[PDB]
Design a protein around this ligand. Structure first.
Ligand code: RPQ
Ligand code: CA
Ligand code: CA
Ligand code: CA
Length: 1038
């Protein structure tokens, strides 16, 4: 019975929280208080992750520094308390929130990259020549190969040049100080159209431009390169193209190839016009459209376009290099290169002429788990099974040894890996052998490709580099993930994992096959830091690899301002349920070690502030968690339904596809109005800015996941990869099926897109599997698909609802479930039509738990239609089996500071003269009486409507609890509690911390004990409305 699960949910259905210990400031008192608070809210467990240590926050006097006996004692006490209370625990595989580092790791055991040095020497009899040492992270380096290259031309790779600049932005409403300029350090800055000019003594032949930045700068990659011989007639060379890039893009410079150009003068023209708005695969374009360049280096030696990325040193995608840029003349044949490893100071004999001595080897990338404290150190080598095992043994395994082994064996059931923040890597000591087994040929002779030196042809080079990247991503799965999965089963743990993309070269779906619990992430009020693409990686991964529980780190808030409460979290949560998550993890519960300070310790103001010292914790968090649990009991039932699978291609890196990127492929499915708004948005005219949250200025045409509810207008889709196609896909009854229950009718092979611009050719195997699926009846539409839907092919929309209604559909042996959620902040009445023929629908309310088994419905064209009224932000589940107030005076007690006042009229606290009410945050108890004339009749239902509630209210009538009201409709069923005559009305109203913190900031604190390390505040500088504002009314229905 689904009803037993909805009314009595199982433990799997409960939401969890991340629990962050800050700066080693931890106490047993606070531990007990936190774990009891979590139990009281109805949480299932917590992930215990310490962040930073004493050194990073000396002011807090921490005594529980990571890995000290005192810290381990606190971990033990937490396990003991979680055992007592019936909570489960997880921990991360390292200290801090990312990723797999620790002080036990040496440079040799860390993430490795290919490095090199060179010198030009005359050939002949070389004896005892000392070659320059390549990059050696903390002295660690190891040679791999030494190559001898014949010199192409004989001139310097770079020459000196006189650098000038000029503003050209005319249309004079301009701030003259923000026009182009070069500072003392040679750094170039501009906000306005301009050019930077380089004048050489003699004509210089340039084939590429290395752009060197100080942090990220989208606009630096948008320069238009021009050249001249005579200083006035300038010819176009190339409009540069930004590579796709994530947020961790500063480990390498960027090389832009150009057609070989010989000139005395080069100009780089810039304008902000034509900028793409920001996204997760052009992270730098989220920021202000200002130009900032540390150095442009113009080079002579041929290099592949955007080679740093193509070599796998950083996560990047760009087009193959054109033949106009790298012709066969520009590439070295294998027979031209002499391999001098064996001789290697160097003593050997080369032919005559001049030779380049490319000394190649490997060193650490230098990445650490930087948010750790006592457990901080180098990131483990991600391709080395032993280093990965070692990392497991030294942190996570130790929680079963250093605490209390029998208690740890019962409560510590979850091992987590968060989202990658340790860059990329492209070598390890097993990498040549792995490449050979997997790709079927030897990489070693082609090692100079990893320096972007072209060999044989531009195409052969880039085909090989793609293979390197493919191997890289395969090894993240087959080593790092495989090893941790084995370790997890060995310790009887479930394995949760977040995204690898867009920081480590990877197929972003691929690793989810190895984990029990794929985990996405969604942010609150943080468009610059939100990760909708991560969400779709985790969901798509779970769906294609058959993982039924999909966790999500939810409500992460880049700057929390203390005005947040469950009411304004609901719509955000509901649209992520619509995407397919079904176990929320709250981000974040911060341990507050002091019982006398509130709201206390935070992650330096990064929200959501989800913890015991919230004004609304005791009643608000519990009510919300009840909603969540009921929602999740049903959203974990059976299998998700999606009719459309979309192939993610054969470029590397790769990941799930965002809805926006499919609009030119399926313009019909999205509709003409979506096509039109995308063209306006992407044209990004004037590069408009928005500030959200306070102090975060960014591109206003950023794709906003709130504007992409139900984007395929009644269908759902998963991204789907080569591995799933080749290893798992089956045709059954006209649909493509996978183990775990995915069944798709349609397979979209998208048009070339930003993340797959070539696009990479389909391998013969893929072509062969696609053809088998065409023949077994699977729709593989011709693109662009221009019809409104797939009903011409007998595939109707699953749910027809109006815009701004989020939904999902699950199906199992006991029937069908549609989750339907209003995203607008208004009451709406609308028809929902479901693809269900001849079964009786019911309406199950996840806020109250009420089940209405007898709703009206029509049956038309073999669908079922229902009329729904949804209050602001209201959600429902559709399940298919297989008169004013006349009150006496109010007594209002403000419990935090004991004030009590009498009032006839309801009032906004923030408008009172008394500063202890004006600035009050917390709970106030309202007490009054009312007359009810008649006895409550049969079939008759009575609601106390609260009107406007700031922000949360618990209703007691004649001492009977009639519920905690936190979202619309703001009303309480008082039917069972009503008596004839005089009724007693008690209402507890709770607001948010914002007003009290504003009071405390200004010396007008409404009570003592107010402190937090969270410093961010709303820009508005206003007191929020607060209280039972009403008006109060009764509603008598049937
Ligand atoms: C706030 C932390 C958060 O706690 C972590 O999940 C980490 O993945 C991250 N990425 N950006 N910001 N964070
Ligand atoms: Ca994360
Ligand atoms: Ca493709
Ligand atoms: Ca794309």
């Amino acid at each position: 019975l689904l009803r037993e699960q909805f009314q009595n949910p199982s433990d799997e259905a409960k939401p969890w929280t991340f629990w962050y210990w800050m700066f080693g400031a931890v106490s047993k008192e606070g531990i007990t208080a936190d774990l009891e608070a979590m139990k009281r809210a109805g949480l299932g467990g917590t992930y215990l992750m310490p962040i930073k240590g004493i050194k990073e926050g000396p002011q807090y006097n921490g005594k529980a520094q990571q890995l000290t006996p005192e810290w381990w004692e606190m971990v033990r006490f937490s396990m003991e308390e979680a055992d007592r209370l019936g909570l489960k625990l997880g921990m991360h595989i390292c200290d801090g929130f990312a990723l797999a580092g620790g002080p036990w790791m040496t440079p040799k055991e860390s993430m490795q990259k290919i490095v090199w040095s060179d010198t030009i020497v005359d050939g002949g009899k070389i004896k005892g020549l000392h070659l320059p040492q390549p990059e050696a992270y903390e002295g660690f380096y190891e040679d791999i190969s030494l190559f001898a290259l014949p010199v192409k031309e004989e001139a310097a790779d770079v020459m000196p040049a006189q650098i000038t600049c000029a503003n050209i932005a005319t249309g004079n409403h301009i701030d003259i100080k923000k026009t182009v300029n070069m500072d003392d350090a040679g750094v170039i800055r501009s906000s306005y159209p301009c050019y930077i000019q380089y004048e050489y003594e003699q004509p210089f032949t340039c084939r590429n431009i290395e752009i060197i930045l100080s942090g990220n700068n989208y606009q630096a990659h948008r320069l238009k390169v021009m050249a001249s011989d005579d200083g006035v007639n300038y010819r176009l060379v190339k409009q540069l193209v930004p590579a796709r890039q994530g947020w961790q893009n500063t480990d390498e410079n960027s090389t832009h190839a150009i057609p070989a150009t010989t000139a005395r003068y080069f100009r780089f023209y810039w304008t902000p016009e034509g900028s793409e708005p920001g996204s997760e695969d052009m992270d730098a374009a989220k920021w202000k459209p200002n130009l900032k360049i540390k150095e442009l280096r113009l080079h002579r030696e041929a290099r592949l376009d955007q080679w740093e990325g193509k070599a796998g040193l950083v996560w990047r995608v760009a087009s193959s290099t054109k033949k106009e840029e790298i012709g066969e003349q520009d590439c070295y044949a294998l027979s031209q290169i002499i391999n001098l490893t064996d001789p290697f100071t160097l003593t050997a004999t080369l032919p005559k002429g001049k030779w380049k001595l490319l000394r190649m080897g490997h060193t650490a990338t230098g990445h650490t788990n930087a948010t750790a404290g006592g457990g901080k150190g180098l990131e483990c080598d991600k391709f080395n099974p032993k280093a990965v095992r070692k990392q497991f043994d030294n942190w996570f395994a130790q929680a079963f040894v250093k605490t209390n082994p029998d208690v740890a064996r019962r409560v510590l059931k979850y091992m987590h890996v968060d989202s990658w923040e340790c860059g990329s890597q492209n070598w390890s000591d097993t990498f040549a052998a792995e490449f050979r087994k997997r790709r079927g040929y030897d990489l070693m002779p082609y090692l100079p490709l990893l320096a972007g030196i072209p060999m044989e042809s531009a195409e052969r080079s880039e085909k090989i580099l793609r293979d390197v990247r493919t191997t890289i991503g395969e090894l993240v799965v087959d080593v790092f993930y495989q090893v941790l999965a084995d370790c997890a089963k060995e310790y009887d743990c479930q394995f949760s994992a977040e995204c690898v993309a867009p920081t480590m070269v990877s197929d972003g779906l691929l690793h989810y096959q190895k984990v029990d619990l794929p985990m996405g992430e969604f942010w609150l009020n943080s468009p610059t830091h939100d990760k909708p693409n991560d969400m779709l990686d985790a969901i798509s991964g779970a769906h294609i690899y058959g993982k039924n529980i999909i966790q999500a780190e939810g409500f992460t808030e880049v700057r929390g301002t203390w005005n947040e409460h469950p009411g304004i979290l609901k719509a955000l949560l509901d649209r992520n349920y619509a995407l397919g998550i079904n176990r929320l993890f709250f981000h974040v519960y911060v341990h507050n070690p002091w019982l006398d300070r509130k709201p206390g310790m935070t992650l330096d103001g990064i929200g959501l502030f989800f913890q015991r010292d919230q004004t609304w914790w005791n009643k608000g968090a519990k009510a919300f968690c009840e909603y969540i649990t009921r929602c999740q009991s049903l959203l974990q039932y059976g299998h998700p339904v999606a009719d459309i699978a979309v192939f993610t291609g054969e470029e590397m890196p790769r990941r799930s596809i965002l809805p926006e990127r499919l609009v030119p492929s399926l313009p019909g499915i999205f509709g003409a109005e979506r096509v039109e708004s995308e063209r306006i948005r992407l044209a990004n005219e004037g590069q408009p800015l928005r500030v959200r949250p306070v102090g975060v200025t960014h591109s206003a045409n950023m794709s906003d996941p709130e504007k992409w509810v139900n984007p395929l207008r009644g269908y759902a889709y998963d991204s789907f990869n080569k591995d799933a196609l080749l290893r798992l896909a089956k045709a059954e009854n006209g649909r493509m099926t996978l183990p775990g229950g995915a069944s798709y009718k349609v397979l979209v092979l998208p048009l070339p897109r930003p993340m797959n611009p070539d696009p990479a050719a389909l391998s013969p195997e893929v072509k062969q599997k696609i053809n088998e699926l065409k023949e077994a009846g699977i729709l593989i539409p011709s693109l662009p698909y221009k019809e409104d839907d797939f009903s011409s092919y007998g595939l109707e929309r699953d749910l027809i609802v109006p815009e701004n209604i989020a939904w999902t559909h699950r199906q199992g042996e006991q029937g069908d479930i549609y989750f339907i959620a209003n995203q607008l902040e208004e009451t709406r009445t609308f028809t929902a039509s479901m693809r269900i023929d001849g079964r009786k629908p019911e309406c199950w309310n996840p806020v109250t738990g009420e089940i209405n088994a007898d709703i009206p419905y029509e049956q038309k064209s073999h669908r079922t239609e229902i009329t729904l009224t949804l209050a602001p932000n209201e959600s429902v589940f559709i399940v298919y089996p297989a008169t004013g107030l006349e009150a006496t005076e109010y007594t209002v007690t403000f419990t935090a500071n004991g004030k009590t006042i009498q009032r006839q009229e309801l009032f906004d606290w923030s408008k009172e003269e008394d500063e202890q009410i004006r600035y009050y945050s917390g709970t106030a108890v309202y007490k009054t009486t009312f007359r009810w004339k008649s006895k409550v009749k049969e079939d008759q239902q009575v609601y106390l409507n609260l009107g406007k509630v700031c922000d949360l209210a618990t209703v007691r009538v004649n001492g009977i609890d009639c519920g905690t009201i936190w979202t619309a409709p703001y009303r309480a069923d008082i039917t069972a509690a009503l008596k004839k005559g005089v009724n007693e009305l008690e209402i507890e109203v709770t607001n948010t911390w914002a007003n009290a913190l504003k009071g405390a900031d200004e010396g007008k604190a409404p009570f003592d004990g107010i402190w937090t390390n969270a410093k961010y505040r709303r820009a508005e500088n206003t007191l929020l409305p607060a209280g039972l504002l009403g008006p109060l009314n009764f509603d008598v229905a049937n």
